[PDB]
């Protein structure tokens, strides 16, 4: 016999690819104001007898999520109010160990011929002293940056967004459950979009993410490398209740012709420290399980949890975006115990929390955002779905392993949510031999 070249179009094959993914989804939220809906339901195709390599540490979907959150954040923040006219000397004393101060200042009015002394309430962590007189203060970042106040109409609710492939492309999902982050996945499926992922800003604890199916799964590119992040994904969440129990007034002043600036106004009632209430039994059971799994990656050593010796405050303390407010909670108490191989299993754990209004997510050089004051009282609650941990080096031959909260790199949180996905391109055209010319 003889064979001829035959051409088939619509061949079910693919190659690795990077393409641009777009949004879809199920208040003026910075992430959802100009997007499209998802299909009523995603479809799933099980790719029987298909095995493919995944790598969570080299996933370009993570890099796109990073680029998008920065661009979306900036688009929303840009058309707001410049606070430069307010970079004048503040004069105050405190109103909780001096945490809140009521400061007067000299600011030019919309009338160019007039100046108005005015007042604003600030948190201590946003201002610094001037020329050692114990009364004069400056906004902490004004020396090098432009501080912009976010428009009060913008919501920061982290509404989950699905990432969808363009025509000609597909997203493959890994369904192994206990997948270790790389190498082959032997049970995979084809989808059009990812599940919705919430763009939650966080540092040490992973809040409002997905849970593991069977066990706590601990992933690291190399457990031996003490410089890398260890990502712990829990199969059960831990409940955290956060409150800022201070009945506030929203006050506004103008800082130019249509430029409104919002400050904390008169406080109703007394001043109290913000707190986050974590169930103790749940945290204790969670740590026991984490340790059992960490022990499996090392030579069955005792595990102790400690606090960081340094890093920016945004790194050292656990921070999160609450009801539009920014919390910095003292997590030391959550990582202050030694767990043993022969150890097995009631009240509350309370974290004092500090509040800051001037923040700089993603370290934009020369820029900072000023959070608006929020009146009334704030309550929010979250689910703790994971942890970003690191490992203390220098412990070879010490007989114990020492772990500390790590994190601070937002991409490590996105590596968890995008963990199961890979992007491929469809290559529908190909050839094979046939019997006929």
């Amino acid at each position, epitope marked *: 016999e003889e064979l001829w070249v035959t051409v088939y179009y619509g061949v079910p094959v693919w190659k690795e690819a990077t393409t641009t993914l777009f949004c879809a989804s199920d208040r003026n939220v910075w992430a959802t104001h100009a997007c499209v809906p998802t299909d009523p339901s995603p479809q799933e195709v099980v790719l029987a007898n298909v095995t493919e390599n995944f790598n969570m*540490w*080299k996933n370009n979907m993570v890099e796109q999520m990073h680029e998008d959150i920065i661009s979306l954040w900036d688009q929303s923040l840009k058309p707001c109010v410049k606070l430069t006219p307010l970079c004048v000397t503040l004069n105050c004393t405190d109103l909780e160990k001096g945490e809140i101060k009521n400061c007067s200042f000299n600011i030019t009015t919309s009338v160019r011929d007039k100046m108005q002394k005015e007042y604003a309430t600030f948190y201590k962590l946003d201002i610094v002293p001037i020329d050692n007189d114990n009364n004069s203060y400056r906004l902490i970042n004004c020396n*090098t940056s432009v501080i912009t106040q976010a428009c009060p109409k913008v919501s920061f609710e982290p509404i989950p967004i699905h990432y969808c492939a363009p025509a000609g492309f597909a997203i493959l999902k890994c369904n192994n459950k206990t997948f270790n982050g790389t190498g082959p996945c032997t049970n995979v499926s084809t989808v059009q979009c990812t599940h919705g992922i919430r763009p939650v800003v966080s540092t040490q604890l992973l809040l409002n993410g997905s849970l593991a199916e069977e066990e706590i799964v601990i992933r690291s*590119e*190399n457990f*031996t*490398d*003490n*410089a*890398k992040t260890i990502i712990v994904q829990l199969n059960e969440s831990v409940e955290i209740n956060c409150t800022r129990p201070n009945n506030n007034t929203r006050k506004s002043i103008h800082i130019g012709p249509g430029r409104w600036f919002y400050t904390t106004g008169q406080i109703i009632g007394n001043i109290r420290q913000a707190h986050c209430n974590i169930s103790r039994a749940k945290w204790n059971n969670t740590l026991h399980k984490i340790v059992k799994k960490l022990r499996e990656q090392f030579r069955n050593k005792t595990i102790v949890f400690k606090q*960081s*010796s*340094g*890093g*920016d405050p945004e*790194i050292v303390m656990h921070s999160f975006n609450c009801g539009g407010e920014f919390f910095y909670c003292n997590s030391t108490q959550l990582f202050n115990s030694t767990w043993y191989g022969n150890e097995s299993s009631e009240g509350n754990i309370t974290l004092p929390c500090r509040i800051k209004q001037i923040i700089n997510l993603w*370290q934009e*050089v020369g820029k900072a955002m000023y959070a608006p004051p929020i009146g009334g009282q704030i309550r929010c609650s979250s689910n703790i779905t994971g942890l970003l941990l*690191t490992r*203390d*080096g*220098g*412990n*070879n*031959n*010490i007989t114990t392993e020492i772990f500390r909260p*790590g*994190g*601070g*790199d937002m991409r490590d949180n996105w590596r968890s949510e995008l963990y199961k996905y890979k992007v491929v391109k469809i290559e529908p055209l190909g050839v094979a031999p046939t019997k006929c010319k």
Partner: antibody
Framework: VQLVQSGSGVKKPGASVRVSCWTSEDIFERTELIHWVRQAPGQGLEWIGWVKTVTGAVNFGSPDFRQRVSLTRDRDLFTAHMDIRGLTQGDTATYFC????????????????WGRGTLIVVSS | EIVLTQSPGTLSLSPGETASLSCTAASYGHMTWYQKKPGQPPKLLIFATSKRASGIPDRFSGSQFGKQYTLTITRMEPEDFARYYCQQLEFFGQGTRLEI
């Protein structure tokens, strides 16, 4: 550009010393991890610790450095710092600042650049 | 107890010979090498995966057999009679000297 290294002073026991190193914007912002090492005369090379250029997170090669040495970094001024407290004669050594740009994961730890180095002397 | 063991410590080779320097890796893993001259900072010679470091004109090479990584010096070029060190992530070896 080779890392610019300052210091090389002499201290009495119990004293503190601050050592820093500098690079250009283009090198600093392409570097993920800055490491510090120690080379006491005749002793070989000992790792001290590291500072992550993104978060300021730190680690150490020993619990004793963790207790006495404060490590940090500066984003606007492209520098890094090693603040050593409680100096003793046993700390006399040449110290070096070095960079790892190798965001290569499991490949391992590499030093693309070592700076000139500084000699810290502790004596009575 | 000992993470990285340096061998042989001291070698003596005339120019034109090939050096063979090596270290044993506790718990395996990758291993890299650096070259030092007195009064100078060290420089990277080879990656822990045996890729040559940029700047090296094909004088150094190596590979790993189980736990032992071996680095060699082609024809003992005189410029390379340096002290050499092994590195395995956070640990460094003791160092090897070259004489004539």
């Amino acid at each position: 550009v080779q890392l610019v290294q300052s210091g090389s002073g002499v201290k009495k026991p119990g004293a503190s010393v601050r050592v820093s190193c500098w690079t250009s914007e283009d090198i600093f912002e392409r570097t993920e991890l800055i490491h510090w090492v120690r080379q006491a005369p005749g002793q070989g090379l000992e790792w001290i610790g590291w500072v992550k250029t993104v978060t300021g997170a730190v680690n150490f090669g020993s619990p004793d450095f963790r207790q006495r040495v404060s490590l940090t970094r500066d984003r606007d001024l492209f520098t890094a710092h090693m603040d050593i407290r409680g100096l003793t004669q046993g700390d006399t050594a040449t110290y070096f600042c070095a960079r790892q740009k190798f965001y290569t994961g499991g490949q391992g730890w590499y030093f693309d650049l070592w700076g000139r180095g500084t000699l810290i002397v502790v004596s009575s | 107890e000992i993470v990285l063991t340096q061998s042989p410590g001291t070698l003596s080779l005339s120019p034109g010979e090939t050096a063979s320097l090596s270290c044993t890796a506790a718990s395996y893993g990758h291993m890299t090498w650096y070259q030092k001259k007195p009064g100078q900072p060290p420089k990277l010679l080879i990656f822990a995966t045996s890729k040559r470091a940029s700047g090296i004109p094909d004088r150094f090479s190596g590979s790993q057999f189980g736990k032992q990584y071996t680095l060699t010096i082609t024809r003992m070029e005189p410029e390379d009679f340096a002290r050499y060190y092994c590195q395995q992530l956070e640990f460094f070896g003791q160092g090897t000297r070259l004489e004539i």
